[PDB]
Design a protein around this ligand. Structure first.
Ligand SMILES: C=CC[C@@H]1/C=C(\C)C[C@H](C)C[C@H](OC)[C@H]2O[C@@](O)(C(=O)C(=O)N3CCCC[C@H]3C(=O)O[C@H](/C(C)=C/[C@@H]3CC[C@@H](O)[C@H](OC)C3)[C@H](C)[C@@H](O)CC1=O)[C@H](C)C[C@@H]2OC
Length: 192
């Protein structure tokens, strides 16, 4: 407790905790975060109390205390935009796609991860090495997906925050999704 510190890293979807010595440069935490997430260090920007962290700075330098939060930002440089549509769906483009645009009628191919609002992962197509294909705009998937995947471009990564009436509602999903749950997905569009 004297020499080490526990810190929370949030990326807006989930959280991972790290314990490092107070004299250890944050590089070690940043690298551990990047490796666990399968991301390049150079793709990530870290903030503490709104100030950009540099990798050679220590918790001691920044007067950090146990359970302080570091934000990890993977989204495009220049300032994020969370869009709320008329349905109450929210979406945020973490990566802007460069390819073909997804439109209703297409059988599109994606990877996804889904979390509850407390950051617990409930599913991932990547964890089973299994891209997911569906008829976009067909009513075959939950409403937040039909609405939210429309307009993505191939290469894009979009975060959907789906209120339960656009998800599984009061029923939930057996074994997996509670009644009245808000769902967070990161969807990566692979093909249309
Ligand atoms: C024969 C049927 C099996 C068939 C299963 C598959 C092809 C495998 C496929 C990878 C699903 C996953 O299997 C591991 C698993 O994905 C979740 O974990 C998940 O991440 C999720 O939420 N997804 C999946 C990705 C698209 C968004 C959403 C969805 O819309 O999923 C859809 C869904 C469940 C829609 C319901 C349908 C009933 C409506 O009444 C309800 O309306 C509220 C909405 C899925 C894709 C359906 O179109 C097709 C199926 O169900 C669910 C939490 C539970 C689900 O297992 C069942």
């Amino acid at each position: 407790p004297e020499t080490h510190i526990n810190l929370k890293v949030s990326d807006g979807s989930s959280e991972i905790f790290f314990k490092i010595k107070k004299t250890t440069p944050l590089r070690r935490l940043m690298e551990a975060f990047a490796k666990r997430q399968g991301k390049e260090m150079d793709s990530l920007r870290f903030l503490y109390d709104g100030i950009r962290i540099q990798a050679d700075q220590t918790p001691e330098d920044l007067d950090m205390e146990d359970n302080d939060i570091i934000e990890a930002h993977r989204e495009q440089i220049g300032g994020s935009t969370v869009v709320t549509t008329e349905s109450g769906l929210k979406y945020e483009d973490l990566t802007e796609g460069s390819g073909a645009e997804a439109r209703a009628g297409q059988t599109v191919s994606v990877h996804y991860t889904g979390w509850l609002t407390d950051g617990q992962k409930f599913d991932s197509s990547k964890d089973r090495n299994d891209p997911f294909a569906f008829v976009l705009g067909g009513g075959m998937v939950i409403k937040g997906w039909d609405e939210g995947v429309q307009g993505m471009k191939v290469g894009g990564v979009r975060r959907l925050t789906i209120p339960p009436q656009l998800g599984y509602g009061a029923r939930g999903a057996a074994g997996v999704i509670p009644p009245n749950a808000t769902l967070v997905f990161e969807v990566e569009l692979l093909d249309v």
